[PDB]
Amino acid sequence: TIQEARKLLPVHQYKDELLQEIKKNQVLIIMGETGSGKTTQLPQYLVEDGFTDQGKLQIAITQPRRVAATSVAARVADEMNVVLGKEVGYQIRFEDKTTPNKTVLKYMTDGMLLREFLTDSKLSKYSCIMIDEAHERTLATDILIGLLKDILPQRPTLKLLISSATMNAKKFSEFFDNCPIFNVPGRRYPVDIHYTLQPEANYIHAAITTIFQIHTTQSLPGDILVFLTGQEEIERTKTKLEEIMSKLGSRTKQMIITPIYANLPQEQQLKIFQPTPENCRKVVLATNIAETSLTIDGIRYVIDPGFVKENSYVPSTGMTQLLTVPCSRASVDQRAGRAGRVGPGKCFRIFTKWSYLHELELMPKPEITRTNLSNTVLLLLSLGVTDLIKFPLMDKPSIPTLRKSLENLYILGALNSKGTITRLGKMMCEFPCEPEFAKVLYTAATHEQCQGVLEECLTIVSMLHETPSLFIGQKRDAAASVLSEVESDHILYLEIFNQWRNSKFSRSWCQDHKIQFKTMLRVRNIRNQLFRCSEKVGLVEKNDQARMKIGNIAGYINARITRCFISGFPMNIVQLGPTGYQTMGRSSGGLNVSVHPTSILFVNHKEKAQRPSKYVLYQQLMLTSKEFIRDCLVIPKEEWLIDMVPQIFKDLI
Amino acid sequence: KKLVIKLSENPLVEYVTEKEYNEVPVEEFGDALLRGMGWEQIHPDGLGIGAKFMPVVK
């Protein structure tokens, strides 16, 4: 059952030894491996012991990812014998599946407890707070241990718990004034680690061939796990492992392919939890270790090419390009240790043994050293943190990274010239999004040349949160079905949601125009969150009045929206140089960026004979073969560029 | 040249003026804000770690 396979987890032998120590200490550090019974069973012991005091106080468990917050909360809701959300909830950025008077245990992310400091400074709803995966060193975790350190002398009733690996757990003890380290080891079974003989020409073709020689030439029971970089690599792998499986037929053995990534339907997430039938081999595809953890945990094989896609800070502008890097030697050893949970597993590594020892970093760097920090500093200045150097967090950001996040909040007008947090800066804290998405919604309701288009800018901003999951097939086939001639990628996203709204949110509409219906229900939910937050601020009333003054005509609306994204993203403006599109700014010369072929602006150069635009506004930069602009926006006039943010473009233009 | 922006270390500014951006510019705000505290590769994606489809024989 599920009530007896929980006893075989390594934390049940350490049950009463650990409940006695949390009653003694205020902060305690639990040390071990990823998913060794803790964060699934240990929050269940705290509820039954009575640390919540009859549901008056809550318990927050802080997962680092969006995917690991929901899946682990659903897995505990099976064990608790509660439905979900009533007694065991979760809190994503845009999803709050809790009820306020019954939720006792809740599994949120790192950004959503960090946002909880606004409405409550001392975190008075919570009696126990557990930070999970503190060795990952995400930015919203590295700040959240600094802010909880400042409120430890003021509330002694709070109890803090930190889960980390067996390598970083001493540095967290040095940080919390010689904190006691409790140790929960796992059943370490030996894993036989294999390396290839040559540098591989492709890590996907070698990873598909590796699954087949494990499937054919090895016996059951053993389930396969593959670590892939992104969701575009997983679904390219899942379909191609479905094509070659079809030619085999019923000859070999059953293969259940079970991917783990974000924005997934419930019929695929129930395939995570239920065990395999006999004469069946589950092949799990995922990206990080913390989501692959299972209670039954029948997996015994791991394939790793050793790559993580992560947001590297751009040296020219203030933003973070998405870049794919070799992962660290400590992170590879977390992946090989996934096979040795129940039995003696095997680990297949696409890189050679030489590149393991002499080309990988021995320990992964923290995220806080190479990031935007624009949402960070505006968050700390709103909480009363005046000094940013003397703030006592453990790894501190560099000064060129920190001065760029100050002068980007000054171009947005979120910081005063005297350094105080302005009313626009107090407004950007209210919206559950990036502070540059909050400038676009402010410009669309209040600006003297741009008011009237908040209803069209709550649509396009909601479409940009769910860009890669919108459509089935290619986008150049789906774009011609909704509107025959679009020029920029933002107006196309305005046209898709309006026509879907005009068809009364039809399931049959999205299948005709090659659009995923499950994505558009989330975009419709993000829009309901961003519109409800614009009512409390007052940008709704300021645009209902600005629309009754001027009833705008559709020839001007696409020019209002273009200006509303210049004022929110002024550094993401790219000029057509003599060699190509080139990043335009006062810091560095340029990056010689090209357009991603998924964007609709690449289609208008090949399919159409239109000349290339002079100014293009992107939402996201990425580097695979060269730098690629995604989510384009065409700016045909220099006059729209100076008249919105003149503090940059007066000297440049 | 040598300016120090102090913070509110213990009613509002609705809009920032274009006069205000010519007095204290963007580049001057990055340096002078920290004076209050006293401050004064390419992965083609088709390769592997070391670098430089139908597996059916038919």
Q: Give residue limits of the domains in chain B.
A: 1-7+14-40
Rg of chain A, C-alpha, whole Å: 26
d(CA A333, CA A624): 26
Residue B46 in contact with partner chain A when CB distance is under 8 A:
yes
DSSP track, A568-579: T-SS-EEEE-SS
Nearest one of A160, A131, A192 to A26, comparing CA atoms: A160
Whether A285 and A259 have beta carbons less than 8 Å apart is answered as yes
Contact B36 A384 (CB under 8 A): no
Contact A419 B31 (CB under 8 A): no
A320-326 and A307-313 beta bridge pairing: antiparallel
Rg of chain B, C-alpha, whole Å: 26
Name the experiment that determined this structure.
cryo-EM
Contact B30 A406 (CB under 8 A): yes
Which of B6, B49, B55 shows the shortest C-beta gap to A351? B49
In order of A31, A195, A305, A520, the CA distances from A93 in angstroms are 28, 40, 31, 17
Distance from CA of B1 to the nearest CA of A (A): 16
Nearest CA in chain B to A411: B26
Per the structure block, which two tokens stand in for A141?
Answer: 């975790």
Nearest one of A536, A534, A529 to A91, comparing CA atoms: A529
d(CA A159, CA A157): 6
Per the structure block, which two tokens stand in for B24?
Answer: 């204290």
Class of residue A610 by CB neighbours under 10 A (exposed 0-12, middle 13-18, buried 19+): exposed
Note the Cα A125 to chain centre separation in Å: 26
Q: What share of chain B is helix, strand, coil (3-state, %, to 5)?
A: 20, 0, 80
The owner of tokens 């006039």 is A637
A573-576 and A581-583 beta bridge pairing: antiparallel
Whether A377 and A368 have beta carbons less than 8 Å apart is answered as no
Residues 6 through 45 of chain B touching chain A, CB cutoff 8 Å: 6-10, 12-16, 18, 20-21, 23-27, 29-31, 33-34, 36-39, 42-45
Containing A348, the helix (H) or strand (E) segment is strand A346-349
Residue A229: helix, strand or coil by DSSP? coil
Whether A87 and A70 have beta carbons less than 8 Å apart is answered as no
Please state whether the peptide bond connecting residue A277 to the residue before it is cis, i.e. omega within 30 degrees of 0: no
Whether A623 and A323 have beta carbons less than 8 Å apart is answered as yes
Q: Give the count of beta carbons closer than 10 Å to the beta carbon of residue A608.
A: 10
Q: Which amino acid is at A304?
A: D
d(CA A545, CA A416): 28
What residues have CB less than 8 Å from A280, skipping those under 6 apart? A220, A253, A254, A255, A256
Long-range contacts of A530-538 (CB under 8 A, 24+ apart): A530/A431, A530/A432, A530/A433, A530/A441, A530/A458, A530/A461, A530/A462, A531/A458, A533/A430, A533/A431, A533/A432, A534/A431, A534/A441, A534/A445, A534/A454, A534/A458, A536/A430, A537/A427, A537/A430, A537/A431
Residue A130: helix, strand or coil by DSSP? strand
d(CA A68, CA B58): 42
Q: Give the count of beta carbons closer than 10 Å to the beta carbon of residue A200.
A: 20
For residue A629, the cross-strand partners are A595, A621
DSSP code, position A269: H
d(CA A351, CA A286): 19
In order of A76, A190, A563, the CA distances from A187 in angstroms are 22, 10, 59
Residue A43: helix, strand or coil by DSSP? helix
Note the Cα A426 to chain centre separation in Å: 24
Residue A424: helix, strand or coil by DSSP? helix
d(CA B12, CA A566): 25
Whether B28 and B3 have beta carbons less than 8 Å apart is answered as yes
Which of B7, B26, B48 shows the shortest C-beta gap to A647? B26
d(CA A317, CA A436): 14
Per the structure block, which two tokens stand in for A169?
Answer: 């757990």
Give the mutation candidate from B19, B45, B53, B54 for the A interface (greatest A CB count, under 10 A).
B45
SS (H, E, C) A373-409: CHHHHHHHHHCCCCCCCCCCCCCCCCHHHHHHHHHHH
The owner of tokens 């692959």 is A292
Give the mutation candidate from B33, B39, B40, B47 for the A interface (greatest A CB count, under 10 A).
B33
> Residue A189: what are its φ and ψ, rounded to 5°?
-95, 150
Residue A20: helix, strand or coil by DSSP? helix
Q: Which amino acid is at A570?
A: P
Q: What per-residue string of b and e applies to A215-245 under the rule 16 or more CB within 10 Å gives b?
A: beeeeeebbbbbbbbbbebbeebeeebeeeb
